[PDB]
Amino acid sequence: KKIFDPQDKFLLYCNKLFVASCILSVFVDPFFFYLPVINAESKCLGIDRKLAITASTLRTFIDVFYLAHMALQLRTAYIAPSSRVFGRGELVIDPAQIAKRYLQRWFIIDFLSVLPLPQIVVWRFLQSSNGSDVLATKQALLFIVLVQYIPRFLRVLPLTSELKRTAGVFAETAWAGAAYYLLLYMLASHIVGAFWYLLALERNDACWQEACIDAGNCSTDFLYCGNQNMDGYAVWNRAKESVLKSKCRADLDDNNPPFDFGIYTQALSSGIVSSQNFIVKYCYCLWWGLQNLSTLGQGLETSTYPMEIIFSISLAISGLILFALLIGNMQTYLQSLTIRLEEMRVKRRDSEQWMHHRMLPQDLRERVRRYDQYKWLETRGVDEEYLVQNLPKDLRRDIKRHLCLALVRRVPLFKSMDDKLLDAICMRLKPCLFTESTYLVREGDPVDEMLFIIRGRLESVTTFFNRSLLKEGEFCGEELLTWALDPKSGVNLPSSTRTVKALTEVEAFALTSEELKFVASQF
Amino acid sequence: KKIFDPQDKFLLYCNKLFVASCILSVFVDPFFFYLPVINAESKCLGIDRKLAITASTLRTFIDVFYLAHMALQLRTAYIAPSSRVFGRGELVIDPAQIAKRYLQRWFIIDFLSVLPLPQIVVWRFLQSSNGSDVLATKQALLFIVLVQYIPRFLRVLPLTSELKRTAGVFAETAWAGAAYYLLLYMLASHIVGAFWYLLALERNDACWQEACIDAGNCSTDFLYCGNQNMDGYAVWNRAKESVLKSKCRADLDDNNPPFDFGIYTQALSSGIVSSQNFIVKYCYCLWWGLQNLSTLGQGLETSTYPMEIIFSISLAISGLILFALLIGNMQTYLQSLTIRLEEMRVKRRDSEQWMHHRMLPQDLRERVRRYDQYKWLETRGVDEEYLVQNLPKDLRRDIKRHLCLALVRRVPLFKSMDDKLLDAICMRLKPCLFTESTYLVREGDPVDEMLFIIRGRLESVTTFFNRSLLKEGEFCGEELLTWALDPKSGVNLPSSTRTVKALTEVEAFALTSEELKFVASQF
């Protein structure tokens, strides 16, 4: 039967063009809300038919593509806890109980999403020559899509809210944290503008259905398209555009209109509910969605109709959530971006506080500031030895042999020595930094590190006193070496013979005394 | 008398359905603000009576349920500091001074909340056949509820603002940090919309009380319901709906109305102040509350009346607070959610900075990136040994025996050994990771860790040279073992005999040299 193993590469693209199907499926459900239109020629309420076949086709052509996923987790293995395994889990390709492994918790949420519930509402309407069914199609689309939002957004939640916590294919920039919470706005605006469109047509249907009864010579079947060849429609036809105009007109300047449309008067006064261009209607509703989600409903002037008020409350709450999520994921990105700079500024404020508290002389305060600025310019806050010590030993040894082998193999006692032990010497070379006019050593002081110069120029006088220069590649500290390999010394740090002043800003690699005894005790 | 001990389970449900009573009590106090209505038939100001009995009943049926709490902390013990105790405190069930322990600080705030102050305002109004108390009921409800807000919100502050700092029953998701600061909006909107309703009726009362004096033939007693059978009401009845209409009409299009209602003209022009459906009135006021708290008063067009201006300032300030709290608790949740991913991205930016500063070759830069991505894929930022070392020793030993016992009991010198000492060997097994084509050891190098393979495949050649494979469950590093148990070696790390290349990505458990001498010195 070939029950699949869970880390197959075929179940890596069938979960790559699969979560894309779960993403594109919650964009198609709002397009069923643009199905009711108003035919302004006939003043009847109708259904867009080549948007009905379009949304039914594009939702079915995703859901039977989805039907090749519970027919493939059908062939699936899992991992179970055991101490027999040697490898963190058993794989079970036995088909007798993996069926229950799939169909005990994560089948019902995934089965209540491929159900063609908004496709059978469209079905018995478009297969008729009778206009009576415009009511039922508009009746059975708000709440079915509203309740199927929950299984369709719960089958994208583990693949988004935990693929943002531990992301898989992204590290480096802002193309999945800002460009995800900004397309979460564009999705929610797409859903909210479609609700606004559909509820605007329901309030216009309510107005027309109540203004037709007050006229008396009208049945509410006459307000729907396809009911023109009915008896009594001819006496209603000559009184349509006075009854529906004196009672159900929508203007944005009326403060006491005959019917209050509230937040839906912008939809009926602009005429997008009777728009023949779908680009105009979709763009106008999507922008209403984004404008009222971004500004949390502020400019909503609702009527005293409780479903409309509750729809406005939902917009305010959803916009509050969406805004808090966006600025919280932008602050989390920006704070992690400038973390070393803010650490440098905290460390810099601490040093000013400590030097003011201790009242250091200003020549000693300039030397502290100079070293801190130089260390920030070179390292940028990065602890290099902590980065190196967290690498594998082979990668450590290769990186350290790239950085420090030519420096150690210019010492004459180290170049002719070995390869075994100098590759243990250039694992303790740590980087030192020296600002200008820093005395690296002065005479009489114990030499406690050998320095192999990377960058910058130095100086050396001993006892106008036969000066000696030092530059990029040379070393300094050979008094420590001969002391350390000689066993006739003990722990006796030898005195310095030279005064070594940093002529420029210097980088070096330092080999301290106790790290030199360990490589001298390998004989 | 049975004075209770403070960690009884009976005083765990009598503080579980108790803080629910403290939560539901601050939702009932706004319902006293919807008591004044306008009877649009008679054009009189009245009181809703079956909302008066409803809010009085539902506040009393919470406060004498609350009266079984200071009758139970009456039977209460506490904990006092002493060094006699052995157990961090004395319990005092002596009833002579625990009364002062309750009634010295946290009795007055809890006693000034069960007081039926908004129930006695309702009392002498609904027990009469006279209309000349509608004034006093509306007079004594704004400031009494406004000043009893302070004890009723101070008896929910220690149980919310410190049960959010150290929560008791919640760990894992966003169902108490977003769904608490979003229902803090819905509470504040419930309070603010009720103030808006009540102050809207007070401004309409002010208009009517001043437009009745200007007519001259009217007493202000005539403006209240129940004063119809008074003398002179018949001459006022035929001039009501010209006097109160030319002077006290509310429209939203008038820019110079005869009376300025300001932020309260939306309440009187919509007609919710005379609404017979309480769902319409409550929803319309709650949405005004949420819309003006969410948008911080922006769309308020106040009059030049100072109490209304001060009510608007309070809305702007309260909305600023509520918004800062919501986005600050959402950023705190989201930042703690993606903490390991942001740590990985900081560590990844540091490595690029360091490899660019050191100018590593690109083959060495790919090996660093590959190991960091592999380590992030396996561990997800989790320091496993730090998690294990913070566990109890029995739980450590059981977890480590589950993870690492079958691996150690496949070594032939360890399987026949013991149980005592191999359970001390599999407490030092730490997890290693190897990317593909990583040389685990090469010949001539000192063997310094024994590796017990978890996952991935390996390779082994020695001196096309009789190759040897390694896969899930086998081990590698037996040259370290026989060296370490032999005492005829000293500290002499033996040379390698094989070249071991990771054929796949490998997990292992590593036993280093100095952790193997400690288990070899147990003989």
Side-chain angles (χ1 to χ4, degrees), chain B residues 308-325:
Chain B
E308 161 177 2
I309 280 152
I310 283 163
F311 176 59
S312 304
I313 284 162
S314 299
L315 256 63
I317 288 166
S318 294
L320 284 166
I321 295 162
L322 277 168
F323 189 74
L325 284 181

Side-chain angles (χ1 to χ4, degrees), chain B residues 68-83:
Chain B
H69 182 257
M70 64 284 294
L72 256 69
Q73 293 177 335
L74 295 174
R75 293 182 183 174
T76 59
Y78 69 101
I79 286 94
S82 291
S83 80

Side-chain angles (χ1 to χ4, degrees), chain A residues 81-84 86-88 161-162 164-168 170-173 176 181 255-256 295-306 309-310 312-313 316-317 320-321 323-325 327-329 331-333 335-337 339-340 378-382 384 387-388 390-395 397-399 402-403 420 431 454-455 507 509, chain B residues 182 185-186 251-253 270 272 277 279-280 283-284 286-287 290-291 294-295 298-299 323 326-327 330-331 334-335 337-338 341-354 357-361 364 367-368 371-372 376-377 380 401-404 406-407 410 433-434 438-440 442 444-446 448 453-455 472-473 507 509:
Chain A
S82 291
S83 80
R84 173 202 98 205
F86 302 101
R88 308 273 76 86
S161 183
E162 295 295 283
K164 282 310 161 186
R165 182 174 94 107
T166 50
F170 189 68
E172 296 293 333
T173 174
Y181 281 92
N255 278 267
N256 220 349
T295 65
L296 5 140
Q298 153 144 17
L300 297 187
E301 295 168 278
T302 81
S303 91
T304 74
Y305 178 66
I309 280 152
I310 283 163
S312 304
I313 284 162
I317 288 166
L320 284 166
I321 295 162
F323 189 74
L325 284 181
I327 67 181
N329 263 273
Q331 152 57 32
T332 310
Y333 174 77
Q335 186 209 9
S336 165
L337 206 80
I339 175 172
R340 301 284 173 247
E378 287 321 294
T379 71
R380 302 285 184 185
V382 179
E384 163 173 1
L387 280 195
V388 170
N390 285 351
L391 284 182
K393 185 188 178 28
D394 50 276
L395 188 48
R397 206 201 308 114
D398 292 350
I399 281 172
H402 177 264
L403 295 186
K420 200 36 181 269
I454 295 161
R455 197 190 67 192
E507 292 212 27
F509 272 124
Chain B
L182 284 163
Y185 269 106
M186 296 305 286
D251 298 59
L252 281 161
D253 59 353
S270 78
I272 56 160
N277 206 16
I279 297 298
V280 162
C283 282
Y284 197 86
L286 167 79
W287 163 241
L290 176 66
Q291 190 195 32
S294 267
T295 65
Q298 153 144 17
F323 189 74
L326 168 82
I327 67 181
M330 193 88 65
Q331 152 57 32
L334 288 162
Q335 186 209 9
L337 205 80
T338 60
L341 183 83
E342 290 321 297
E343 279 179 4
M344 195 264 313
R345 292 166 169 190
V346 169
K347 179 205 160 176
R348 184 67 265 161
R349 279 186 278 261
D350 288 1
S351 295
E352 298 303 316
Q353 176 82 237
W354 161 71
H357 171 65
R358 289 288 179 228
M359 290 307 285
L360 256 65
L364 274 171
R367 290 168 56 177
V368 163
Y371 178 76
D372 284 353
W376 166 251
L377 281 186
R380 302 285 184 185
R401 276 204 300 111
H402 177 264
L403 295 186
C404 314
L407 292 176
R410 211 179 167 185
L433 292 187
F434 306 99
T438 295
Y439 282 97
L440 279 78
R442 40 180 77 249
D445 289 345
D448 44 346
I453 312 299
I454 294 161
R455 197 190 67 192
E472 292 87 338
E507 292 212 27
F509 272 124

Side-chain angles (χ1 to χ4, degrees), chain B residues 87-295:
Chain B
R88 308 273 76 86
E90 296 175 353
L91 275 66
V92 181
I93 62 167
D94 183 76
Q97 172 290 339
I98 59 168
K100 299 270 178 211
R101 168 83 268 181
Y102 197 66
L103 282 74
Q104 71 95 27
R105 191 42 176 263
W106 278 112
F107 186 69
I108 55 170
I109 301 106
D110 212 8
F111 183 67
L112 300 177
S113 300
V114 278
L115 269 176
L117 285 192
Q119 281 85 251
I120 58 166
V121 180
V122 187
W123 163 248
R124 71 183 190 274
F125 176 73
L126 271 83
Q127 298 294 320
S128 295
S129 266
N130 198 354
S132 40
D133 210 0
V134 193
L135 260 172
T137 306
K138 182 191 199 328
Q139 255 152 327
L141 279 173
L142 176 89
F143 290 109
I144 315 180
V145 175
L146 185 45
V147 300
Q148 218 161 346
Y149 274 157
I150 312 173
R152 275 158 98 85
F153 265 125
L154 273 179
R155 63 167 208 194
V156 313
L157 203 146
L159 302 177
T160 47
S161 183
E162 295 295 283
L163 177 63
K164 282 310 161 186
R165 182 174 94 107
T166 50
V169 299
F170 189 68
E172 296 293 333
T173 174
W175 276 106
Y180 171 81
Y181 281 93
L182 284 163
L183 299 170
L184 207 61
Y185 269 106
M186 296 305 286
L187 166 68
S189 316
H190 173 60
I191 302 155
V192 155
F195 273 103
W196 177 66
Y197 181 84
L198 181 70
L199 288 174
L201 268 299
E202 165 60 37
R203 284 314 268 154
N204 205 343
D205 196 4
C207 191
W208 285 17
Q209 263 183 301
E210 92 180 13
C212 161
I213 302 178
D214 301 334
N217 63 299
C218 169
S219 176
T220 76
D221 293 353
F222 295 161
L223 308 165
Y224 297 99
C225 308
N227 294 344
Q228 303 94 9
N229 44 27
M230 305 214 304
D231 47 58
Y233 194 75
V235 73
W236 168 244
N237 209 317
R238 297 168 292 192
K240 264 190 302 191
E241 296 177 354
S242 55
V243 166
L244 302 179
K245 191 174 267 296
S246 58
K247 304 205 70 189
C248 288
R249 70 189 176 278
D251 298 59
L252 281 161
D253 59 353
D254 290 340
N255 278 266
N256 220 349
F259 198 94
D260 208 355
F261 292 112
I263 58 165
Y264 314 122
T265 175
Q266 199 195 314
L268 317 159
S269 64
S270 78
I272 56 160
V273 300
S274 192
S275 190
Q276 291 292 280
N277 206 16
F278 181 71
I279 297 298
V280 162
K281 163 193 305 200
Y282 174 69
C283 282
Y284 197 86
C285 295
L286 167 79
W287 163 241
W288 189 94
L290 176 66
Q291 190 195 32
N292 290 278
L293 277 179
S294 267
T295 65

Side-chain angles (χ1 to χ4, degrees), chain A residues 97-319:
Chain A
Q97 172 290 339
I98 59 168
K100 299 270 178 211
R101 168 83 268 181
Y102 197 67
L103 282 74
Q104 71 95 27
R105 191 42 176 263
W106 278 112
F107 186 69
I108 55 170
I109 301 106
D110 212 8
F111 183 67
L112 299 177
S113 300
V114 278
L115 269 176
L117 285 192
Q119 281 85 250
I120 58 166
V121 180
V122 187
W123 163 248
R124 71 183 190 273
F125 176 73
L126 271 83
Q127 298 294 320
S128 295
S129 266
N130 198 354
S132 40
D133 209 0
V134 193
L135 260 172
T137 306
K138 182 191 199 328
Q139 255 152 327
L141 279 174
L142 176 89
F143 290 109
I144 315 180
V145 175
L146 185 45
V147 300
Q148 218 161 346
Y149 274 157
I150 312 173
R152 275 158 98 85
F153 265 125
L154 273 179
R155 63 167 208 194
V156 313
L157 203 146
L159 302 177
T160 47
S161 183
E162 295 295 283
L163 177 63
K164 282 310 161 186
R165 182 174 94 107
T166 50
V169 299
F170 189 68
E172 296 293 333
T173 174
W175 277 106
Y180 171 81
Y181 281 92
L182 284 163
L183 300 170
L184 208 61
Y185 269 106
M186 296 305 286
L187 166 68
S189 316
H190 173 60
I191 302 155
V192 155
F195 273 103
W196 177 66
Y197 181 84
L198 181 70
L199 288 174
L201 268 299
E202 165 60 37
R203 284 314 268 154
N204 205 343
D205 196 4
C207 191
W208 286 17
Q209 263 183 301
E210 92 180 13
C212 161
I213 302 178
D214 301 334
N217 63 299
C218 169
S219 176
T220 76
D221 293 353
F222 295 161
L223 308 165
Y224 297 99
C225 308
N227 294 344
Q228 303 94 9
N229 44 27
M230 305 214 304
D231 47 58
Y233 194 75
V235 73
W236 168 244
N237 209 316
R238 297 168 292 192
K240 264 190 302 191
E241 296 177 354
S242 55
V243 166
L244 302 179
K245 191 174 267 296
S246 58
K247 304 205 70 189
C248 288
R249 69 189 176 278
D251 298 59
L252 281 161
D253 59 353
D254 290 340
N255 278 267
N256 220 349
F259 198 94
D260 208 355
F261 292 111
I263 58 165
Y264 314 122
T265 175
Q266 199 195 314
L268 317 159
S269 64
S270 78
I272 56 160
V273 300
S274 192
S275 190
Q276 291 292 280
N277 206 16
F278 181 71
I279 298 298
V280 162
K281 163 193 305 200
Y282 174 69
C283 282
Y284 197 86
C285 295
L286 167 79
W287 163 241
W288 189 94
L290 176 66
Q291 190 196 32
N292 290 278
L293 277 179
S294 267
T295 65
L296 5 140
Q298 153 144 17
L300 297 187
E301 295 168 278
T302 81
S303 91
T304 74
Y305 178 66
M307 176 62 207
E308 162 177 2
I309 280 152
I310 283 163
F311 176 59
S312 304
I313 284 162
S314 299
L315 256 63
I317 288 166
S318 294

Side-chain angles (χ1 to χ4, degrees), chain A residues 16-59:
Chain A
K16 178 206 154 288
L17 287 148
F18 169 75
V19 69
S21 178
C22 308
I23 284 165
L24 208 146
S25 68
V26 294
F27 267 86
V28 166
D29 281 327
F31 283 107
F32 291 99
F33 285 176
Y34 296 100
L35 293 199
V37 301
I38 290 159
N39 188 268
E41 299 168 345
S42 191
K43 289 295 284 281
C44 60
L45 310 151
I47 288 281
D48 207 355
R49 270 169 187 181
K50 47 179 193 293
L51 179 72
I53 64 174
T54 299
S56 150
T57 291
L58 288 193
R59 180 170 154 159

